[PDB]
């Protein structure tokens, strides 16, 4: 079902795309898993700990 | 750099460094540039870059 | 909102009580960043009452862990609302869905 | 001995999206210039950004204003996304006055001859009361890069806005075979740029090339 | 102040050898170190004009995998030695050099019959090693002028990988650099080794000149 939804959005079924290095423009030699993850900022800020 | 418990090195690379060295030292059967003869490591680096 | 969720976000957001939930259905008579005024439908009003529901929103109050508790409305002027509808999003809530 | 590139086409796909074609290019030079120009365009392009706001009756962003849909924080965030091109000066003060129910947008900002609002439909806030009225003084400054308000070195009521001066949003480049007069080894560089609408794509390309040449001047005569 | 960028205040050149340099520029704008280093690296690797050996014809040797009596090394090793032969051809875009040698000894580049326009950078470069007093090696070396590196795979004439670019090695590193308050600045260290035709400083200047002249149409 995930691969079907990827097809519906015209995205590769493997979930891996060709990425380029911003520093040099060079192609990374293998496809890289690129997607969206839901990230959280935990209440462990370095401001309160330093 | 060595471990006092057993004398083995304790600064050993792990994770990304090990993966990078392994990937760079792996060989492929029909990789681009196979069969070339190089003057040295500098020419290999120039060809790769 | 999480692009990938489980469907439990709405239940958590509603049951936590951090959101403003419509006690009765009606139409948004007034709305601003601090308050919501709902004109209750005629079928949900009791005899001898104006039929106005007022929801005063919590604005920038510290939590027990010194985090910000802020409610902002998620409805517009004149919008129709139903009973159990989320009127104002709470902290870490997006349109009635838990948004951590 | 090298065939230098020329600007040969500028396809303005939309107001904020354009394509610039450089041709002809020697082998390898397409990607070299592509990456150099991409980095310089993404990091060094100047633009005008909102840096200070003064709303009447407001003391700080963590407050509400009667008759206004949004918090002052959300109004400030909306103003941070306001795209403006100022002509002939590095700093301007815009005035916004609105009354009555309706969306308060960028089109309601008091017109100034030297200031242009590229996107008048940008919503700043919403007035939800008939008697509600909002009045603000918006300071727009010219700069480059990202300058947070916290790091900037004032009466109460002047709200600092983080300034994202960069007008460039996305840069992509492609190197394709270009049919040369006789040679088949030359290429062409298509640079696709998405901006906020406040910079001319040819102006951006020339600015990036000028920055690169000035940076190269140190190496051209090494000592 | 939006049109002015930082320029390198400190430029330090460390001559590790006659053909090896370490050039440090400090400070640069954030990210400019990678931009300049990568652009110069690409130009030096792939675009620098130079003269290099491209073909050779050896009498008695008719294929790549073949043997010749009297020479210690194999034909592959002789080609590997010829690849490293640094040559400056002032006069033309193409020349032929004749190497005729006999007797026991190290056959080097000095033994090549002299032509005025052709200049051998280092005469002691060992082409091969003759071991027999009656062993004779006579070959014709085609030197051509080109750009960058052209492998022989992309092209009895024995093909040699053409190392036109005088750059033997180019690398760059970006370190942290700071001015009075700004601490997010770039420091560019370029470690470069040439083949002796031109010193690393001159090659860096030539690469920068090429890149700058590429931008002529667009510079204000």
* Helix (H), strand (E), coil (C) string for chain A: CHHHHHHHCCCCCCCEECCECCCCCCECCCCEECCCCCCCCCCCCHHHHC
Indicate yes or no: CB of B46 within 8 angstroms of CB of E45. yes
User: Closest Cα to residue D219, out of E203, A8, E75, A38?
Assistant: E203
Residues 51-70, chain D: which have Cβ within 8 Å of C? 62-70
Residue for token digits 């034909």? E75
User: Would the CB atoms of C100 and A40 count as touching at under 8 Å?
Assistant: yes
Please name the method used to determine this structure: cryo-EM
CB–CB of C77 and D128 under 8 A? yes
Helix (H) or strand (E) run with residue E163 in it: strand E162-163
- How far apart are the C-alpha atoms of C24 and C49, rounded to whole Å? 14
Kindly list the residues from chain C whose CB atom is less than 8 angstroms away from the CB atom of residue A43: 65, 67
Nearest C-alpha of chain E: how many angstroms from B36? 8
DSSP E15-65: ESSSSEEEEEEEEE-TTHHHHHHHHHHHHHHHT-EEEEEEEEEETT--SSS
Query: Would you give the DSSP letter of residue D110?
Result: P
Record: fold of D46-164: RNA Polymerase Alpha Subunit; Chain A, domain 2 (2.170.120)
Assess whether chains E and A touch, using the rule of 3 or more C-beta pairs within 8 angstroms: yes
In the CATH scheme, what architecture does the domain C18-92 have? Beta Barrel (2.40)
Q: Does C61 touch chain D (CB under 8 A)?
A: no
Place of tokens 């300034």: D163
Contact D38 A24 (CB under 8 A): no
Report, in angstroms and rounded to the nearest whole number, the Rg of chain B calculated over CA atoms.
17
Which residues precede gaps in chain C, with C-N > 2.5 A? none
Contact B39 E80 (CB under 8 A): yes
Q: In angstroms, what separates the C-alpha of A25 from chain E's closest C-alpha?
A: 9
Q: How many residues are present in chain D?
A: 223
Other CB atoms within a 10 A radius of the CB of residue A20 amount to 15
Give the separation between CA E9 and CA E26, rounded to whole angstroms: 6
CA distance D102 to D98: 9
- Closest residue to E31, CB basis, from D7, D31, D39: D39
Contact C33, D63 (CB under 8 A): no
Planar angle of CA C90, C95, C99, nearest 5 degrees: 65
Angstrom CA distances, D64 to C69, C76, D55, D70, D73, stand at: 14, 16, 11, 8, 9
The closest of B26, D11, E172 to A30, measured between CA atoms, is: B26
Q: Cβ contact (<8 Å) for E46 and D27?
A: yes
Half-sphere exposure (Cβ direction) of C10: Cα atoms closer than 13 Å: 6
* Nearest residue, CB atoms, C32 vs list D62, D63, D69: D69
Among chain E residues, CA nearest to D28: E46
Do E and C touch, counting CB pairs below 8 Å (3 needed)? Answer: no
* Helix-then-strand count for chain D, H and E: 3, 14
CB pairs under 8 A between C and D: 34
Instruction: Name the architecture of domain E49-163.
Output: Beta Complex (2.170)
Contacts of D31 in chain A (CB under 8 A): 25
Which of E34, E36, E43 is the mutation pick for testing A, counting most A CBs within 10 A? E34
What gap in Å lies between CA C46 and CA C54, rounded to an integer?
16
Q: Return the beta strands (E) in chain D as ranges.
A: 6-14, 17-25, 46-55, 84-86, 91-99, 102-105, 115-117, 123-127, 133-144, 146-147, 158-160, 163-164, 168-177, 187-195
User: The tokens of D68 are what?
Assistant: 């206004």
Q: Quick check: D34 and A25 CB within 8 A? A: yes
Neighbours of chain E (3+ CB pairs under 8 A): A, B, D
Q: How many helices (H) and strands (E) does chain C have?
A: 1, 11
Q: Is the dihedral of CA E143, E145, E147, E150 positive or negative?
A: negative
Token couple for D138: 């918006």
Give the Cα separation of E186 and E35 in Å (integer).
11
* Contacts with E168 from chain B: Cβ below 8 Å: 42-43, 46
- Cα atoms in the Cβ-side hemisphere of radius 13 Å centred on E29: 20
Which residues, including other chains, have CB under 8 Å from residue E159's CB and lie 6 or more apart? E54, E55, E152
Report chain A residues whose CB lies below 8 A from the CB of C67: 43
Give the experimental resolution in Å.
2.4
Phi, psi of D109 (to 5 degrees): -70, 135
Name the phi and psi angles at E175, rounded to 5: -115, 170
Interchain contact E83–D (C-beta under 8 A): no
E36 to chain A, closest Cα gap in Å = 10
CA angle E25, A21, E218 (to 5 degrees): 60
D-chain residues within 8 Å CB-CB of C79?
A: none
B43 sits in which H/E element:
helix B41-48
Contact yes or no for E169 and B42 at CB 8 A = yes
- Among chain B residues, CA nearest to E160: B37
Chain D residue whose CA is closest to A27:
D31
Whether residues B46 and E167 touch (CB distance < 8 A) is answered with yes
Q: Which of A1, A15, A38 would best serve as a mutation to test chain C binding (most C beta carbons within 10 A)?
A: A38
Distance CA E204, CA E207 (A): 5
Chain A interface residues (partner C, CB cutoff 8 A): 36, 38, 40, 43
Distance of alpha carbon C71 from alpha carbon C34, whole angstroms = 8
* Chains touching chain B, criterion 3+ CB pairs below 8 Å: E
Distance from CA of D39 to the nearest CA of A (A): 8
CA geometry: angle D74, D80, D84, nearest 5 deg:
135
């Amino acid at each position: 079902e995930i691969k079907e939804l990827l097809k519906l959005g015209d995205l590769p079924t493997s979930g891996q795309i060709r990425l380029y290095d911003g520093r040099t423009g060079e192609q990374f030699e293998r496809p890289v898993t690129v997607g969206y993850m839901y990230m959280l900022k935990l209440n462990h800020l370095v401001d309160d700990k330093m | 750099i060595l471990s006092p418990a057993n004398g083995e090195p304790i600064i050993v690379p792990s994770q990304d460094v090990v993966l990078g060295l392994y990937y760079m030292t792996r060989d492929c059967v029909n990789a681009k540039g196979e069969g070339m003869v190089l003057t040295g490591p500098k020419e290999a680096e120039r060809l790769y870059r | 909102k999480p692009l990938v969720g489980t469907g439990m976000e709405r239940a958590v957001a509603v049951d936590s009580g951090v959101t403003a939930v419509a006690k009765r259905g009606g139409v948004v008579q007034y709305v601003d960043a601090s308050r919501i005024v709902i004109k209750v439908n005629e079928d949900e009003m009791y005899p001898g009452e104006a039929g106005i529901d007022i929801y005063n929103l919590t604005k920038y109050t510290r939590s027990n862990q010194n985090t910000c508790i802020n409610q902002m409305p998620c409805v517009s002027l004149g919008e129709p609302v139903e009973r159990g509808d989320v009127l104002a999003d709470g902290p870490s809530t997006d349109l009635g869905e838990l948004a951590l | 001995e090298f065939l230098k590139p020329r600007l040969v086409d500028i396809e303005q796909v939309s107001s904020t999206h354009a394509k610039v074609t450089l041709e002809p290019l020697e082998r390898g030079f397409g990607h070299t210039l592509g990456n150099a120009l991409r980095r310089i365009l993404l990091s060094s392009m100047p633009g005008c950004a909102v840096t200070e706001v003064e709303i009447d009756g407001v003391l700080h962003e963590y407050s509400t204003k009667e008759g206004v849909q949004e918090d002052i924080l959300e109004i400030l965030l909306n103003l941070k996304g306001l795209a403006v091109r100022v002509q002939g000066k590095d700093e301007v003060i815009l005035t916004l006055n609105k009354s009555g129910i309706g969306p308060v947008t960028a089109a309601d900002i008091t017109h100034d001859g030297d200031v242009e609002i590229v996107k008048p439909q940008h919503v700043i806030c919403h007035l939800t009361d008939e008697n509600a009225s909002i009045s603000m003084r918006i300071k727009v400054q010219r700069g480059r890069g990202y300058v947070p308000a916290s790091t900037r070195i004032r009466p109460i009521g002047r709200l600092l806005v983080d300034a994202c001066y960069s007008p460039v949003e996305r840069i992509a480049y492609n190197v394709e075979a270009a049919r040369v007069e006789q040679r088949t080894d030359l290429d062409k560089l298509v640079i696709e740029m998405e901006t906020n609408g406040t910079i001319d794509p040819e102006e951006a390309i020339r600015r990036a090339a000028t920055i690169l040449a000035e940076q190269l001047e140190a190496f051209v005569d090494l000592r």
